[PDB]
Symmetry: C4
Subunit: 93 residues, 4 copies
Amino acid sequence: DKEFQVLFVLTILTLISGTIFYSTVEGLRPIDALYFSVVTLTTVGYGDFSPQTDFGKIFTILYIFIGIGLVFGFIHKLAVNVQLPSILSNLVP
Amino acid sequence: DKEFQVLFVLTILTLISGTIFYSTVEGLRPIDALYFSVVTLTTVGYGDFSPQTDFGKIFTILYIFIGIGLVFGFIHKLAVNVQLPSILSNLVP
Amino acid sequence: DKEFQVLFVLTILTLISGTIFYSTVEGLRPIDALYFSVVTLTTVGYGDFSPQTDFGKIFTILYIFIGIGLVFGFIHKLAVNVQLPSILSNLVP
Amino acid sequence: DKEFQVLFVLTILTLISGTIFYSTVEGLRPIDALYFSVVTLTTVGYGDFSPQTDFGKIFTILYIFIGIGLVFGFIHKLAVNVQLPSILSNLVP
Ligand SMILES: [Rb+]
Ligand SMILES: [Rb+]
Ligand SMILES: [Rb+]
């Protein structure tokens, strides 16, 4: 509950940072930058977007190292502390 | 057993949702949409397919966050509660 | 030791299967098919190669679900039961 | 502390190796090679860069298997032994 709340907030802030950075330095629209930030930190990494500037590459290196742990923490607690009880609730006779 | 059964079903439903969504909104064939849904949620993310519409990008953000935990749960219990005993069975003298 | 040995063998067989499949059905050279099989099951997924046939897409769906757990098992025990002691050995005064 | 210190050093050395290898054999600039090494070992795998030579493909296979465990170890202990207390410190009334 409180754990999930913190991780949601932390995830939102990280994604806001990426949205601002990539829309500014890499010139992406502020939906494409959000989309790209999510595709990056979840490691899906389609490559339809990727940094073309050296500033962007360096930021992306740091963004990945800092952001992956947080994003996957959130995914983990979202699945465990929100999705897992909910699926069980849909089971009990 | 019962755990694996639930996770298979949950995984199938998630993949059906993606198949329907991406075939409709992104115009993919209903084998390409399934393939793309799997490549996305397993985070392989080749990028031979990716959403081109804003609707598709927004759905993909949510689809990844909701679906990755479930898909990797299934992969985990498939490997542990199905593959792991099977490999041991092929070992015992 | 015995654990790592089994996982290496299991990983090799999975990669041989992919090498054979993608060189045959997708027409890749039998170094490109191995390379592509590894890039797939480790989820790096560059997309410089990807299946173009429906046979290839369907196999890839199944290959990912079956193979990821095994490959990451091996990576995990390679890091823990081989790399982790080795790094400690290079430490003790 | 000491754990994180070792993993940072180990991660740096692995990334230096990739930077040297891909700048030499694949002809990348020594910022693009670092960027590509990071995108590879974190499994983001955009594919804006990828090995074009057989030497590069073979090295990449081995680099991924050896490097992923270490890089994700570092990410894990960076998130747990550095980020996790820091976020808690910003919480206590
Ligand atoms: Rb990935
Ligand atoms: Rb990827
Ligand atoms: Rb990719």
